[PDB]
Amino acid sequence: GSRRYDSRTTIFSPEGRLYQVEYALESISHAGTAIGIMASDGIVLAAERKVTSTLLEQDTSTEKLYKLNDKIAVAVAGLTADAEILINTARIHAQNYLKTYNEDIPVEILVRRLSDIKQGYTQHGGLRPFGVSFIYAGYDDRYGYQLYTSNPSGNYTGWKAISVGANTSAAQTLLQMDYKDDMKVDDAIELALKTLSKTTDSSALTYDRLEFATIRKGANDGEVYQKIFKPQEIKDILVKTGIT
């Protein structure tokens, strides 16, 4: 019957590893790099659109930076289509929570729930893992600005700065080297772009090749704010940081 054709996606290797998760993680390594850096007064998300044309509509596009609710956003590396499946259910879990508690979902709870879905595909059902890694950038009034990563395995961790996708080794050492805890947000913007400049496989790093977003807080307001950068604004911020 069927047994012949089963890849058995949820089995251990003799080394105690999960083939599918590892090859999924291998897949992600080829995907464009995403970086998140958390400062005292906000968070930065930067990502590299992998492969472009001059005919690609830059404005009406989204492939790496997605909004989950008003306080939580994600950087994506891997299969875009898989990510949207997970992103939608995440957007929903955030809303179920609001309906139940009349408060916005705390970032960790969102991250755990999503990662628990991922761990599922790892352990039963015999389907392939989601070929997706996530940087989560969020704010809640318990832990302030938070940064999280999750991958196909179902594991999430918290960070001061992190990167997913291609060249994370190169990127992770560069961040570890220039990151100071009491960074202001405009320092963190600058560092994120530098690191991406230094890891790219392209000629250089133009605006059409970037997605960029910040979670801030207009100092004379007392409430959080998400800003996804329009293609023009990324070109502005590329000039000031000194890579024209």
């Binding site: 890849s7 090859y23 291998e26 005919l55 690609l56 289509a81 015999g126 389907l127 893992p129 070929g131």
Partner: protein, 250 residues
Amino acid sequence: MTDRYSFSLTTFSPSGKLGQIDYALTAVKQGVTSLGIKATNGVVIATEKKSSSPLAMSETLSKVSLLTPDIGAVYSGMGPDYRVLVDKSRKVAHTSYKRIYGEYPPTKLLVSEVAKIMQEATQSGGVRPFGVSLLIAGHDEFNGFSLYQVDPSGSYFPWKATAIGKGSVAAKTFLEKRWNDELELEDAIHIALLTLKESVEGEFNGDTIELAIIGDENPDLLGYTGIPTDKGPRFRKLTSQEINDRLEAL
């Protein structure tokens, strides 16, 4: 009996490749060239009606399909996969949207729905992925004119213009040369026809070519009048004759 295949038939190979998605894209590569170009006041989708016999009637098989009165589709790849993707796309436009909000979905959202339908053939138990790439052209009040590509992976991106299938690499080069953000609709039709001549071997006229636009409303395809806020569909598939007019003065 019963689908005893409840496990994925698309898995990750050691190198990180998804085998079945790669091979699906290969089938698209052999498909007859289709293309789409976006103007400032309209969009155009075109393809070649490659006839498998001169005994077949090529009208009885549309490669260009209306999805909503404001959204059209075209493809490269396996016809049959496209046909059932068109029926599902039409249906989801009602079930997931029209029956909820009393209006048709905007272009991105419907696209996104098709993308979801394909993504699932890439993960669900006991299926291969869809062997087509879709070009979807639409208009909606709040986003204006748009053109989207959907790959067997379930991945979609917006385009100013692009082509898929056979001579797509040549055509994408051809299109980069001729595109600008000041194009009127008539001009993009003209460019579309030219780009498609490169890929067309045999006869090239309004019988061997299928071409559709997303223009302004045709108050005359509506079928009724009296409701002044219904001007009718923006999708119009051009006639065998209408195509030839633009060729006799090509």
